[PDB]
Design a protein around this ligand. Structure first.
Ligand SMILES: Cc1cc2nc3c(=O)[nH]c(=O)nc-3n(C[C@H](O)[C@H](O)[C@H](O)COP(=O)(O)OP(=O)(O)OC[C@H]3O[C@@H](n4cnc5c(N)ncnc54)[C@H](O)[C@@H]3O)c2cc1C
Ligand SMILES: [Mg+2]
Ligand SMILES: [Mg+2]
Length: 309
């Protein structure tokens, strides 16, 4: 009878949940949790916008055009952010920091008063992926006020870092989950591939879960299924400088990398269902987008997502 261990703790303003299947010859749960906590604290010390002395915050505080050296891990995540910026036609843009902060979703204290068009325009003027370059093991910013936010991607990165640690310890059956971003390998305590739920919105407002088995894959979801006014959310449209205003309720992406799935889910959400599903089709990305229609909801699954339903 297979023994599942559940580890939980705090990271990145949220909680992680790791489940794995005990096998002969592996480290005890205390040993594993101790290293998992160290790895995730490192991700936070590299890439947290909320820690004033993180590598990323020190880059945000840096004012020179002069190259700023960063860790291999930060470099890997920023390179992926830039790659996914190209793939999403500019939709995923980690230099939207100033706008995320303006709207109340970052470390900056904001009032309940809506920003003026003048304040918004000032923050838009100091955003844009074009301002950020990678040179060897360094970042450079061609404007001093550039503020990079890796909230959209470094969670997936932490999931990948922990998944690789569990593999390094000879654990081949696991679920790593941080703030809802997941990576799975092998089989659950019942000997079947791990089960995740996709939340479906319903016109009757009843909670509907679809349970799928992704197999050896990462899964990331952006948006929350949960009156008709101004749209206000933490996902910013880089073209408007404002919270996204489109029909997209949620986007679920599968990828071998949780980092990659995380960036893609947010990027495709900002693109909208037409341009987003077109990118998913052209690039063999398994995606499910739920969109609000005139009198209900509709799903769009890419060709590479069809199997999983
Ligand atoms: C390393 C790390 C440390 C964190 N530490 C803290 C903490 O100390 N305290 C705390 O309260 N929260 C913390 N957070 C949480 C963070 O502020 C976000 O709330 C969270 O990461 C949102 O994740 P999500 O999966 O819901 O968002 P996703 O949908 O995956 O991405 C949305 C987030 O990305 C950013 N963003 C918005 N629009 C875009 C865009 N078009 N392109 C690119 N990025 C965009 C914004 O930060 C937004 O919240 C941390 C996150 C990370 C990754
Ligand atoms: Mg994301
Ligand atoms: Mg995310």
């Amino acid at each position: 009878p297979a023994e599942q261990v559940h580890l939980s703790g705090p990271t990145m303003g949220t909680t992680y949940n790791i489940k794995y299947i005990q096998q002969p010859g592996i480290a005890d749960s205390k040993t594993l949790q101790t290293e998992i906590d160290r790895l995730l604290e490192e991700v936070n010390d590299q890439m947290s916008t909320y820690r004033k002395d993180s590598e990323l915050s020190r880059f945000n505080q840096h004012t020179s055009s002069e190259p700023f050296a960063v860790s291999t891990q930060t470099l890997t995540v920023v390179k992926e952010a830039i790659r996914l910026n190209g793939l999403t036609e500019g939709a995923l843009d980690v230099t939207v920091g100033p706008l995320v902060n303006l709207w109340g979703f970052g470390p900056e204290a904001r009032p309940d008063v809506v920003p003026t068009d003048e304040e918004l325009n000032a923050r838009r003027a100091i955003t844009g992926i074009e301002h950020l370059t990678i040179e060897g093991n360094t970042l450079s910013k061609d404007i001093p006020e550039l503020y990079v936010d890796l909230s959209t991607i470094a969670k997936g990165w932490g999931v990948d870092v922990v998944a690789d640690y569990l593999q390094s310890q000879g654990i081949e059956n696991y679920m790593v989950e941080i703030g809802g971003e997941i990576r799975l390998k092998g089989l659950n305590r019942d000997g079947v591939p791990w089960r995740i739920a996709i939340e479906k919105p319903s016109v009757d407002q009843r909670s509907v879960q679809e349970i799928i088995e992704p197999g050896d894959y990462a899964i990331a979801t952006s948006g929350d299924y949960r009156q008709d006014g101004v749209r206000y959310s933490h996902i910013i449209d880089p073209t408007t400088g404002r919270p996204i205003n489109n029909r997209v309720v949620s986007v679920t992406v599968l990828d071998k990398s949780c980092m990659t799935a995380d960036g893609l889910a947010t990027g495709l959400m900002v693109m909208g269902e037409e341009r987003g599903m077109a990118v998913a089709e052209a690039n063999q990305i398994p995606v499910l987008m739920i969109v609000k229609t005139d009198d209900g909801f509709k799903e769009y699954a890419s060709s590479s997502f069809k199997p999983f339903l």
